[PDB]
Design an enzyme around this catalytic site. Structure first.
Site, short mmCIF file in Angstrom:
data_model
loop_
_atom_site.label_atom_id
_atom_site.label_comp_id
_atom_site.label_asym_id
_atom_site.label_seq_id
_atom_site.Cartn_x
_atom_site.Cartn_y
_atom_site.Cartn_z
N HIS A 1 -5.18 2.50 21.82
CA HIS A 1 -5.25 2.22 20.28
C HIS A 1 -6.62 0.99 20.16
CE1 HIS A 1 -4.48 0.98 16.34
NE2 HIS A 1 -4.56 -0.49 17.05
N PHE B 1 3.21 -14.70 -9.64
CA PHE B 1 3.18 -13.39 -9.15
C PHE B 1 1.77 -13.21 -8.48
CE2 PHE B 1 7.23 -12.11 -11.53
CZ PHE B 1 7.70 -13.08 -10.70
N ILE C 1 2.12 7.32 17.14
CA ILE C 1 1.68 6.01 17.84
C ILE C 1 1.20 4.82 16.55
CG2 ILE C 1 -0.10 4.57 19.13
CD1 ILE C 1 2.07 6.40 20.78
N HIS D 1 9.87 -18.82 -11.02
CA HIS D 1 9.01 -18.04 -12.23
C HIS D 1 8.14 -19.26 -12.55
CE1 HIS D 1 11.25 -14.65 -12.24
NE2 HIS D 1 10.51 -13.92 -12.98
N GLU E 1 2.16 -5.16 -8.49
CA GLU E 1 1.08 -6.24 -8.44
C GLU E 1 -0.04 -5.90 -7.36
OE1 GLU E 1 4.46 -7.07 -8.24
OE2 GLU E 1 4.84 -8.10 -10.13
N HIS F 1 -11.49 -0.22 19.23
CA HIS F 1 -10.48 0.70 19.04
C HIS F 1 -10.71 2.20 19.14
CE1 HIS F 1 -9.41 -2.85 16.96
NE2 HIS F 1 -8.04 -2.45 17.12
N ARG G 1 -2.97 -17.78 -23.39
CA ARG G 1 -2.52 -16.40 -22.93
C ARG G 1 -3.14 -15.56 -24.48
NH1 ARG G 1 3.76 -14.68 -24.06
NH2 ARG G 1 4.14 -15.94 -25.83
N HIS H 1 -9.64 -0.17 11.52
CA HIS H 1 -10.05 -0.29 12.99
C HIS H 1 -10.60 0.80 13.70
CE1 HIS H 1 -5.79 1.89 12.93
NE2 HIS H 1 -6.48 2.32 14.24
N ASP I 1 13.08 -19.39 -17.52
CA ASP I 1 12.89 -18.60 -16.35
C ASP I 1 13.19 -19.24 -14.95
OD1 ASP I 1 13.22 -16.24 -17.56
OD2 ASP I 1 11.11 -15.69 -17.47
N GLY J 1 -9.39 -2.93 6.68
CA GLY J 1 -8.75 -3.48 7.97
C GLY J 1 -7.55 -4.02 7.66
N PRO J 2 -7.15 -4.78 6.72
CA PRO J 2 -5.65 -5.07 6.32
C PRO J 2 -5.28 -3.53 5.95
CG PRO J 2 -7.52 -6.81 5.39
CD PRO J 2 -8.23 -5.71 6.08
N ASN K 1 0.04 10.42 14.52
CA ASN K 1 -0.13 10.68 15.91
C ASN K 1 1.13 9.87 16.66
OD1 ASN K 1 -0.63 7.89 15.79
ND2 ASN K 1 -2.83 8.05 15.95
MG LIG Z 1 -1.35 6.20 14.39
#
Ligand SMILES: [Mg+2]
Ligand SMILES: [Cl-]
Ligand SMILES: [Mg+2]
Lengths: 663, 663
Positions: free
Chosen positions: B260, B435, B186, B471, B409, B25, B355, B65, B467, B113-114, B184
């Protein structure tokens, strides 16, 4: 004062139902009963005798925990939710489950509970409505014409998915989405101000929404004004912040989160009813005057609205017979006769990446199936989801079929649910398989709701190569395979992937995840004939052994089937007689008959070797204690795809060795 | 100037590494070089020769990237990333993988990355910085006193997790977080406005951030002033929107999504080097003065800064020895000797919900392990995660150990990663198990980065009851068990519980998910002695077959172990001799010796029955082709928990019956 009486009936029904169940959330039904009553009786067009009316206004209780608020309104309004249903709130086999469930209760438009998602689902419903209107509405005939409403709480507006969906809704300028926000300074756990000090109004104006504030949630005339205003601004989606006080009427626990999530209790209920001038001395009491009020404001109005709509429809039909026929069929989820003639075939000797195969299919579908509508989370060029001869879905042309979701995977998944719930459209959403995790909670709701959406998950393995381990799926197959009511299909070549798409498009009650490659796969001979019947069985014998009884069975899926077939030759040379099973879908295979399974995986053959570029988790169902699996139980690496594959063991040489190793 | 030459060395080094890898990139390094140079060179204190320096400014490339930009900077400024490393960008085994990887490359503070997550991880680092200052800080002595920087793009700000993290960073007034936004127009797939038209600036102000805009992203002067401006407002976080042109310098693809994520190409990089007035004729050219420019601005500055910091530390230890000692032990991840001494015990015949069990351990750890820091996503009440003898972490008191994440979360998950990355703290975060889906991508990054964070996941089954299905976890166990490098522990009672927590806190290279019950569990005779040693094994014989080899082995985890041990006695009455294996953790069991495993699950005993309230997916690894499992492969229901449990087959009589049927 009759409105007040009705409002207090909602309050008091809710509370009593929660006392009887000794479970539930009384606080917000009390705070929010006024704004909800106003919307439901003064603005929404809906027919309690036909909850399924295509052009009814849609409604989403994003704040699911307040379900008794919705159940109260449904019952009082003449939907098929009875008094004995309310007295069975949260009980085994109820029509009144603890959070609302589409498909289980008359008049419930969406399943909510997981916070934030209701809003994003509503955004999908509003997309569907403008898309259908553009496609089908003609001169005079405003056939698709309705609003989309939701009520949410503080939680909802903290969740990223609602943030993504609001950004999107503003960009598409969905002017008929109207969201009522129960703004009460309390969250699941304490004062809002322990986690939250942002300006909601200013964030929403920043997105591009219209925001309108109501100082006193108990003021019906103000809420009514805001909604009037919301509805006149067809440009922006509208948020209405309604300032309320949780558990209004409970002297001790009104101002507090204590009122949010457990029955207020017998002594405090009595005290609360006092505070309402509620004299009725039996529980679950509703005055005749209250029923009458709802019959007048909801039932009579919806009845008439619906009758006119039906008359318009009949005229629409003569004036546009084929168009009206198409719409009919779309509302009923019928695919046009012979639509599959259009689809690609891959001839023996060809090579195709299943993401490309999927693109060719998507284009053949856009041409033959008028209800198709979908896009990608900003990866259209990489996912191959783009409909090349269709327009874009935009604020300027709601008839465009290509949706640009932006980098909003979760909002995408939730909008897709809303599109499907609306009816009249077949949708799909694309992203990298590794990012399926971002929309996981929406997949799960699609599974629960039985929505036949299709996910286009490309770049399915370490073969992705240079982007590295954060972009290489490993456990994503197992994580979906384990989920109830999702079909996962990972086609082994171009033709399997055409069959996979037919199965996804034909689905009626479950979401389908298509798992597709970046890299080219060799067209398989064992797959070429009757692919559809083959893939439909979930696993079939793609390359038979020499004898009726194999020395070993190789099981593989997707990109690993070709590998398994070379391994098979290589082993024949060395006197080992393998059959190869292709398993594009474990879930479909599992639904087959004991006799069919037995014909593909002969119980007497215990020597079985599964091959898949993904977690081994799940494969022992098929390979058992005495078989083995070549999979991947670590993260990937950053290198040319084929170098990782070699290093990770996905070579013929290695498969032959590992196989010879266990017999 | 030498700045401009240094800046275009960043540019060209980045371009050529991508040309040579033929993958990557180019676009963002091109547009973002000036801004990153200014930050790295003129603001951050960091010592290339000690990337691990505890009080360096932390940096996160959220827009991962853009890795060549980071790698260029690291090399040019003398961190241990060499020229040959640059020439092996995206190659097998190299120190320059396609997206930044913490622990793989010197001076990378976080794996990214994510998209969106980088920002949320930065927010956690900034939370650690402040908490640690308040705990450990004192007169004159500013031991913990640094900034947290990130660089993100358009995509990052469309993601819900960055919205949640930003809301939370604003709430906490984390004044030492500065995010540089490469704005940018983009996104990944085309023009930003195909999907995106919101006002980012207005949104951030709405949350409570400071927004400074830099109109021309090539203006080092303008960027530098903005950063100064961010550093005197220690009251709120700062977002600097730097307007750039992606692929700046490219003639045929500057300003286009085309620049890109592909190499420019051999003749287009010729034209670009032309536009920079870059004359060098060899590919990866760094002129001597550029090296020196970095040595003056980064290395020399960094060493002096670390030296001065080192002396102040010296004075601190003399002046507060026991404290200083504590800080040292914390930075080295050391748990105090005998820390586990006040750890709860549960006597035979007792009851406990895990718990609550967990709640008890959390409070005992807050007392004895001083580096603890954690909270809940607005469910402290239900998850039992609150440290009742500790203060709350707030803009007004950072010494507080109780964190209030709100309904976020995902952001909480990524923040926990940022907290573990910082050093100095052991964290946990809590939410309903159902969750866990919401924070899944952050769990994956934790697994990837080998961060020993702890998740407290309560409400683990259909036992949740009223619930309802949205749930009630079903598939959540499998989904986590399939993922590499996550430990999953589902304690069968209170003692197994305490052990799980120890194993979790003792972790150094993998996140641990604790899967905990809402309902009471009976204390188990077989788990009572040497609990820790048994749970550490992953699976163990929790109550023996009378006889040498069993008729059948019953496997169970968590709340199902007691049902199993009860099934075992009804079965004995009936002539079937069964042993019961508790598997609190499949991953820990798999790591045991072949011989330990044979002792718990003898290859001779083929009749094996698994019992767990969750998908059956994965169990066949243990029960094989000849065995069976009682699990749940549909969604749950809204009813009293007890009732759903009976209806779904989790009763002694149904277990006994299904076992007999497989004998
Ligand atoms: Mg951009
Ligand atoms: Cl709320
Ligand atoms: Mg609230």
């Amino acid at each position: 004062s009759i409105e007040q009486l009705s409002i207090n009936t909602i309050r008091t029904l809710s509370i009593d139902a929660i006392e009887k169940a000794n479970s539930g959330h009384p606080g917000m039904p009390m705070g929010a009963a006024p704004m909800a009553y106003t919307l439901w009786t003064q603005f929404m067009k809906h027919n309690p005798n036909n909850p399924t009316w295509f052009n009814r206004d849609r409604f989403v209780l994003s704040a699911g925990h307040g379900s008794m608020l919705l159940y109260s309104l449904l019952h009082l309004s003449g939907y098929d939710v009875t008094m004995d249903d309310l007295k069975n709130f949260r009980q085994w086999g109820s029509k009144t489950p603890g959070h609302p469930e589409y498909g289980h209760t008359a008049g419930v438009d969406a399943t909510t509970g997981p916070l934030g998602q209701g809003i994003a689902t509503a955004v999908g419903m509003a997309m569907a409505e403008r898309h259908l209107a553009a496609k089908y509405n003609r001169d005079a005939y405003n056939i698709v014409d309705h609003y989309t409403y939701a009520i949410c709480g503080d939680g909802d507006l903290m969740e990223g998915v609602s943030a993504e969906a609001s950004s999107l809704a503003a960009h598409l300028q969905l002017g008929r989405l109207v969201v009522l926000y129960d703004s009460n300074d309390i969250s699941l756990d304490g004062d809002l101000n322990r986690s939250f000090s942002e300006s909601v109004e200013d964030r929403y104006k920043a997105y591009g929404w219209q925001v309108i504030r109501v100082e006193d949630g108990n003021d019906i005339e103000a809420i009514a004004k805001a909604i009037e205003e919301a509805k006149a601004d067809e440009k922006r989606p509208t948020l209405i912040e309604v300032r309320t006080t949780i558990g209004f009427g409970s002297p001790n626990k009104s101002g507090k989160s204590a009122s949010h999530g457990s029955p207020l209790g017998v002594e405090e209920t009595k005290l609360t009813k006092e505070a309402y001038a509620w004299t009725a001395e039996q529980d679950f009491h509703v005055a005749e005057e209250v029923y009458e009020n709802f019959r007048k404001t909801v039932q009579d109005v919806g009845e008439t609205a619906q009758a006119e709509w039906n008359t318009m429809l009949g005229e629409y039909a003569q004036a546009y017979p084929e168009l009206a026929n198409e719409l009919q069929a779309a509302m009923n989820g019928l695919l046009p006769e012979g639509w599959e003639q259009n689809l690609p075939t891959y001839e023996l000797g060809s090579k195709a990446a299943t993401r490309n195969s999927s693109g060719a299919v998507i284009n053949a579908i856009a041409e033959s199936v008028p209800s198709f509508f979908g896009g990608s989370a900003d990866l259209a060029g990489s996912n191959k989801t783009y409909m090349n001869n269709e327009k874009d879905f935009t604020r300027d042309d709601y008839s465009g079929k290509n949706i640009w979701y932006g980098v909003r995977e979760f909002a995408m998944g939730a909008a897709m649910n809303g599109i499907a719930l609306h009816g009249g459209l077949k949708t799909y959403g694309g992203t990298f398989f590794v990012f399926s995790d971002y929309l996981r909670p929406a997949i799960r709701l699609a599974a629960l709701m039985q929505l036949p959406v299709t996910y286009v998950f490309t770049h399915d393995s370490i073969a992705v190569g240079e982007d590295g381990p954060t972009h290489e799926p490993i456990e994503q197959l197992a994580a979906l395979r384990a989920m109830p009511n999702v079909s996962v299909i990972r086609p082994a070549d171009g033709n399997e992937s055409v069959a996979a798409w037919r199965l996804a498009l034909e689905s009626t009650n479950k979401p389908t995840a298509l798992v597709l490659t970046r890299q080219d796969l060799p067209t398989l001979e064992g797959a070429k004939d009757d692919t559809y019947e083959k893939v439909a069985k979930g696993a079939y014998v793609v390359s038979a052994s020499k004898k009726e009884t194999a020395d070993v069975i190789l099981l593989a899926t997707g990109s690993e089937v070709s590998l398994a077939v070379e391994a098979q030759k290589a082993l024949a040379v060395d006197g080992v007689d393998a059959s190869v099973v292709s398993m594009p879908s474990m879930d479909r295979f599992e639904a087959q008959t004991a006799e069919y399974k037995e014909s593909v995986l002969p119980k007497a053959v215990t020597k079985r070797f599964a091959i898949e570029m993904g977690a081994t988790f799940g494969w022992h169902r098929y390979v058992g204690l005495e078989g083995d699996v070549l999979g991947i139980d670590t993260f990937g690496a950053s290198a040319p795809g084929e170098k990782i594959m070699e290093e990770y063991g996905f070579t013929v040489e290695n498969v032959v060795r590992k196989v010879k190793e266990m017999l």
